Amino acid sequence: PFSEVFNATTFASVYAWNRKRISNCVADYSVLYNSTSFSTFQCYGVSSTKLNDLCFTNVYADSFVVRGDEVRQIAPGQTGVIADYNYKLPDDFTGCVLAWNSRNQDASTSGNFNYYYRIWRSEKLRPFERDIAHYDYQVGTQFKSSLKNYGFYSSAGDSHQPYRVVVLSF
Amino acid sequence: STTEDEAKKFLNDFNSEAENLTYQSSLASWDYNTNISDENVQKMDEAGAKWSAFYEEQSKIAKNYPLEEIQTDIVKRQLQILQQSGSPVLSEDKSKRLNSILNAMSTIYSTGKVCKPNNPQECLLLEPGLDNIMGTSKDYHERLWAWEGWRAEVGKQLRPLYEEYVVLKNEMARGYHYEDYGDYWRRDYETEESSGPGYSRDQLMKDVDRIFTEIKPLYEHLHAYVRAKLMDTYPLHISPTGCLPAHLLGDMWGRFWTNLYPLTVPFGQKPNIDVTDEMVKQGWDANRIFKEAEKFFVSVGLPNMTEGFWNNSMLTEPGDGRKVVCHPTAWDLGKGDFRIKMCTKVTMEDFLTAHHEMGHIQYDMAYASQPYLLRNGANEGFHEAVGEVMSLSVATPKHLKTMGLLSPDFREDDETEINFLLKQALNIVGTLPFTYMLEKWRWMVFKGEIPKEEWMKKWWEMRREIVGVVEPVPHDETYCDPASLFHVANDYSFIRYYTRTIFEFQFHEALCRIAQHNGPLHKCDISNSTDAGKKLHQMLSVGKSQAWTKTLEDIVGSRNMDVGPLLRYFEPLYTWLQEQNRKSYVGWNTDWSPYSDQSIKVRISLEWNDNEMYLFRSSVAYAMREYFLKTKNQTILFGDENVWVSNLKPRISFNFHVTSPENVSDIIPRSEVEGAIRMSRSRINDAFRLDDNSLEFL
Numbered sequence: 001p002f003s004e005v006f007n008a009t010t011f012a013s014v015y016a017w018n019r020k021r022i023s024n025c026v027a028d029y030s031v032l033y034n035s036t037s038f039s040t041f042q043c044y045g046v047s048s049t050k051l052n053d054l055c056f057t058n059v060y061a062d063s064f065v066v067r068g069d070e071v072r073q074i075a076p077g078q079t080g081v082i083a084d085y086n087y088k089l090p091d092d093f094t095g096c097v098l099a100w101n102s103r104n105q106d107a108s109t110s111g112n113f114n115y116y117y118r119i120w121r122s123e124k125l126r127p128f129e130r131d132i133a134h135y136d137y138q139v140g141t142q143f144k145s146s147l148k149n150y151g152f153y154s155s156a157g158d159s160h161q162p163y164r165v166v167v168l169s170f
Numbered sequence: 171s172t173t174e175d176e177a178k179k180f181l182n183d184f185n186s187e188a189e190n191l192t193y194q195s196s197l198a199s200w201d202y203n204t205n206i207s208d209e210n211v212q213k214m215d216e217a218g219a220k221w222s223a224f225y226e227e228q229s230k231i232a233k234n235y236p237l238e239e240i241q242t243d244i245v246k247r248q249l250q251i252l253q254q255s256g257s258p259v260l261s262e263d264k265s266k267r268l269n270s271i272l273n274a275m276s277t278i279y280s281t282g283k284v285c286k287p288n289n290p291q292e293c294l295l296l297e298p299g300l301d302n303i304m305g306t307s308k309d310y311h312e313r314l315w316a317w318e319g320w321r322a323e324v325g326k327q328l329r330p331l332y333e334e335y336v337v338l339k340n341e342m343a344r345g346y347h348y349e350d351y352g353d354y355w356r357r358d359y360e361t362e363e364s365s366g367p368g369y370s371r372d373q374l375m376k377d378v379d380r381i382f383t384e385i386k387p388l389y390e391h392l393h394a395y396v397r398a399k400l401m402d403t404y405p406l407h408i409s410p411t412g413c414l415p416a417h418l419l420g421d422m423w424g425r426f427w428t429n430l431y432p433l434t435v436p437f438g439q440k441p442n443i444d445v446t447d448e449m450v451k452q453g454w455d456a457n458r459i460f461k462e463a464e465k466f467f468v469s470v471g472l473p474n475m476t477e478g479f480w481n482n483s484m485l486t487e488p489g490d491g492r493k494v495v496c497h498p499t500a501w502d503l504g505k506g507d508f509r510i511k512m513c514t515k516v517t518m519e520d521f522l523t524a525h526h527e528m529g530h531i532q533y534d535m536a537y538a539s540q541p542y543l544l545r546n547g548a549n550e551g552f553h554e555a556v557g558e559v560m561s562l563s564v565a566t567p568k569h570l571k572t573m574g575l576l577s578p579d580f581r582e583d584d585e586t587e588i589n590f591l592l593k594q595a596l597n598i599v600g601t602l603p604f605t606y607m608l609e610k611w612r613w614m615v616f617k618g619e620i621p622k623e624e625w626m627k628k629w630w631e632m633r634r635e636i637v638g639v640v641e642p643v644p645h646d647e648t649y650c651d652p653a654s655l656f657h658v659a660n661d662y663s664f665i666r667y668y669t670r671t672i673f674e675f676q677f678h679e680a681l682c683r684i685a686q687h688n689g690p691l692h693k694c695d696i697s698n699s700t701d702a703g704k705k706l707h708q709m710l711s712v713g714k715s716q717a718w719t720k721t722l723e724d725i726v727g728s729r730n731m732d733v734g735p736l737l738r739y740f741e742p743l744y745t746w747l748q749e750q751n752r753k754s755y756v757g758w759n760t761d762w763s764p765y766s767d768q769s770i771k772v773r774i775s776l777e778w779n780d781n782e783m784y785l786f787r788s789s790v791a792y793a794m795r796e797y798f799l800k801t802k803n804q805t806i807l808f809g810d811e812n813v814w815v816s817n818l819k820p821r822i823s824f825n826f827h828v829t830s831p832e833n834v835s836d837i838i839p840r841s842e843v844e845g846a847i848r849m850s851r852s853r854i855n856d857a858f859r860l861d862d863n864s865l866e867f868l
């Protein structure tokens with residue numbers, strides 16, 4: 001709910017996201033409600049209306065630039081490359097997920113290849129754990145990196161456009 | 171671990187590295203096609219080189235996964251697509267020779283010229299020059315010059331290139347574990363359904379034979395009507411019983427009969443539909459045309475055009491100094507990028523072409539959710555079938571009336587529907603025997619059922635028997651008449667145009683049944699039909715994830731190709747043609763030719779190879795020269811190329827006739843040639859050391 005989480009110039013990749021711990025009391029949530037710039041504001045465990053008066057011990061905010069068609073994978077309870085090998089949410093989730101398009105900042109005409117995702121892991125990720133280790137994996141008869149970079153072009157559809165996703169955790 | 175997991179990992183990595191290269195290649199191709207320059211050729215060449223090298227390499231790894239140990243259908247289909255096409259087993263010199271042969275054939279087709287007999291400096295290319303004559307001229311002799319100069323100055327160049335091309339392509343297809351190149355072309359329609367046996371590659375041949383048998387009577391009646399109308403124009407050139415000459419069919423090859431419409435129109439006093447003036451009025455531009463197409467597709471429930479479609483597509487010719495390719499194409503660039511490149515004029519043809527290309531784009535965004543290998547049509551006919559059935563629904567006069575382009579005072583009588591159905595049939599029914607016969611000839615050329623010494627003989631036998639079209643000039647093995655077509659000289663399969671029409675009219679009948687249409691099928695509009703659009707979107711959503719038989723059964727209720735919807739569409743035209751062809755002869759004989767009545771039959775009675783045939787042609791030319799000098803006091807330089815030989819038995823008999831120099835349409839009368847033979851019989855019979863009894867000269 002802070003300004004520096006949602007207005008950061010550089011956002012983290014999905015495989016190595018940025019978690020920010022918030023323990024203040026300045027949380028009005030009216031900007032998030034009435035911004036009308038969020039493509040996804042659906043969340044679970046709370047009604048998203050009694051959020052202003054309720055208090056919590058700590059608030060954890062994440063940040064990734066996943067593609068448009070894997071914003072739905074940030075929900076709990078389904079598969080997908082982001083949901084399995086990247087950021088994974090537990091079945092009992094008591095936070096909120098916010099996402100918006102970032103074609104003007106994270107896409108270019110020649111392509112923006114600065115954002116990476118993990119294509120394969122040895123085992124599925126447990127909820128709320130992160131791995132940054134650069135390793136190669138085996139396909140066919142060749143060894144190649146497990147981190148593939150997103151191809152973010154300006155002349156691409158909404159499913160292939162960058163989306164800055166901020167996930168609150170209470 | 172298990173091979174399914176390894177195949178899934180390989181396919182995931184291939185997709186992740188493949189949308190990248192496909193999108194980069196598509197962007198380079200778009201930058202060339204909307205901005206033609208030498209700088210943009212190299213970028214496309216580089217991007218295509220990277221994509222092709224990646225594809226052949228990944229097919230080489232893809233061959234390492236055995237298909238018999240995969241249970242998931244999607245992985246099976248993706249690996250089948252990857253393993254079917256890749257790097258051939260051909261050696262580097264043979265592959266270089268094949269590439270050089272293909273480039274030579276394309277260059278000969280694109281740069282061949284035909285020069286006038288009177289003006290050697292007036293040489294005409296095919297696309298602006300000879301196509302205009304073949305589509306617009308009503309002169310028998312000019313059309314004969316254009317038809318005979320082509321296939322002689324171009325097809326004779328393409329004959330040895332095609333002879334080497336057949337061998338090289340058959341070797342390449344045998345390297346892919348196929349019987350020949352025809353089997354490799356028929357691999358598109360092969361499926362493995364879960365329930366029962368699937369579609370085979372021989373089943374395609376059996377099905378197209380059955381479909382042609384079913385369409386034979388309607389084509390026979392249309393042929394009889396066109397012959398009766400083409401007897402008025404060109405009198406004393408068409409037999410009432412025989413085949414139609416190949417150079418009077420509206421184009422160079424007789425592929426479409428649409429240019430015969432001014433000659434074969436019923437009820438010429440009735441004006442046809444032409445709303446082009448109504449869009450010159452009311453301020454219509456290209457944007458209005460494409461917005462109306464988008465409105466039509468929204469009316470059935472299909473999605474809107476994307477925001478990037480309206481920004482990135484080239485809907486008009488650029489006002490600045492940018493050279494573009496003015497061919498209407500719908501582009502699926504990848505990563506959700508759909509564009510249309512077309513130079514839209516304010517015309518009805520451009521309106522219907524916009525609806526066609528928007529149907530292509532709708533198919534693309536429907537199957538965009540599939541994996542990259544499966545993002546195509548169900549077979550090669552489905553895309554064009556969807557485009558033509560959208561164009562069929564849009565072009566109805568009721569749709570134009572509710573669009574405002576047609577005045578409410580316009581009344582649809584029975585005469586206007588006959589004109590519309592005949593104009594449709596000259597493009598739809600007239601092209602089906604030609605397509606079937608050309609694909610049949612190519613299939614038995616690749617299979618080996620036609621030997622190399624019978625190519626033209628079998629070509630003009632099946633042209634007479636199947637299409638009902640006779641050649642105006644006899645053609646020996648020096649000619650290559652199929653190679654004079656674009657698709658044959660540029661290595662393009664042709665059966666997609668055959669299957670497109672059948673699938674298109676099947677889809678039309680299904681969607682008009684769903685839309686609760688009660689009238690005749692040619693007056694059907696699927697606008698505002700959310701059920702028809704729902705069924706169509708269920709069809710288009712599965713691109714190649716399942717068999718095309720299952721998709722066809724899902725949309726039309728039948729697993730097989732059925733031409734019954736096509737015959738039901740043209741039923742009023744069939745009834746009218748049956749009523750008109752009561753005083754005419756329906757059908758044709760394969761014996762009449764334009765040169766048949768004036769030819770003299772020569773019997774050989776006894777080493778008569780091609781050299782003795784050249785000597786005989788020279789003797790006949792000398793006798794012609796002597797007769798014309800000593801009888802009519804005229805000098806005419808008859809040559810061996812002016813003596814045409816037909817019905818050549820290897821050593822038994824043949825027929826010959828003489829044509830004039832500088833005029834291939836001027837066949838010398840048979841009495842004059844007989845008098846020339848009887849005038850100079852001594853030299854002709856002394857050139858081969860024989861008497862007059864052995865050469866009968868009947």
Ligand SMILES: *[C@@H]1O[C@H](CO)[C@@H](O[C@@H]2O[C@H](CO)[C@@H](O[C@@H]3O[C@H](CO[C@H]4O[C@H](CO)[C@@H](O)[C@H](O)[C@@H]4O)[C@@H](O)[C@H](O[C@H]4O[C@H](CO)[C@@H](O)[C@H](O)[C@@H]4O[C@H]4O[C@H](CO)[C@@H](O)[C@H](O)[C@@H]4O)[C@@H]3O)[C@H](O)[C@H]2NC(C)=O)[C@H](O)[C@H]1NC(C)=O
Pocket residue numbers: 113114134135148149150151186187190
């Ligand atoms: C779609 O197509 C595009 C085409 O551009 C392609 O983008 C390119 O991706 C590759 C692969 O990720 C990028 O190359 C990597 O880039 C950085 C360094 O790049 C800097 O310099 C280049 C100048 O060329 C700049 O463009 C760029 O912005 C950066 O400033 C490194 O992360 C990578 O090096 C690692 O990988 C190499 C692979 O062999 C190793 O040789 C190398 O040593 C590095 O690996 C090691 O790194 C650490 C070393 O200590 C270690 O911890 C690790 O374990 C490991 O051993 C690499 O060079 C390239 O820049 C992109 N090109 C652009 C942006 O123009 C996309 O990849 C492609 N997408 C898909 C999905 O196929």
Ligand SMILES: *[C@@H]1O[C@H](CO)[C@@H](O[C@@H]2O[C@H](CO)[C@@H](O)[C@H](O)[C@H]2NC(C)=O)[C@H](O)[C@H]1NC(C)=O
Pocket residue numbers: 205207208209210492
């Ligand atoms: C059409 O293509 C030409 C090249 O043939 C483009 O001109 C290039 O523009 C880039 C970007 O400014 C320059 O770096 C190049 O040097 C230019 N090349 C040449 C040969 O001048 C041109 O921009 C293209 N036009 C459009 C509208 O895209």
Ligand SMILES: *[C@@H]1O[C@H](CO)[C@@H](O[C@@H]2O[C@H](CO)[C@@H](O)[C@H](O)[C@H]2NC(C)=O)[C@H](O)[C@H]1NC(C)=O
Pocket residue numbers: 469569571572573697698
């Ligand atoms: C069915 O589609 C037709 C066009 O094919 C629409 O008909 C016209 O729509 C406009 C705009 O709403 C009206 O002003 C006209 O009166 C309609 N009729 C005619 C004869 O032009 C129609 O709107 C569509 N149906 C629905 C329910 O939207």
Ligand SMILES: *[C@@H]1O[C@H](CO)[C@@H](O[C@@H]2O[C@H](CO)[C@@H](O)[C@H](O)[C@H]2NC(C)=O)[C@H](O)[C@H]1NC(C)=O
Pocket residue numbers: 311312833835836837
């Ligand atoms: C080439 O020969 C044809 C056929 O002899 C000429 O065309 C006409 O032929 C008819 C009979 O078929 C004659 O009655 C006409 O006199 C011929 N000429 C014309 C001008 O109609 C044709 O003229 C000859 N020449 C060319 C250049 O095609």
Ligand SMILES: *[C@@H]1O[C@H](CO)[C@@H](O)[C@H](O)[C@H]1NC(C)=O
Pocket residue numbers: 468473474
């Ligand atoms: C399609 O676009 C038009 C014009 O913007 C809009 O009115 C309509 O609601 C859109 N349809 C759908 C199904 O989104």
Ligand SMILES: *[C@@H]1O[C@H](CO)[C@@H](O)[C@H](O)[C@H]1NC(C)=O
Pocket residue numbers: 477478481
């Ligand atoms: C399309 O172009 C308009 C007008 O320039 C612009 O406002 C809009 O953002 C563009 N849409 C895209 C790039 O998706």
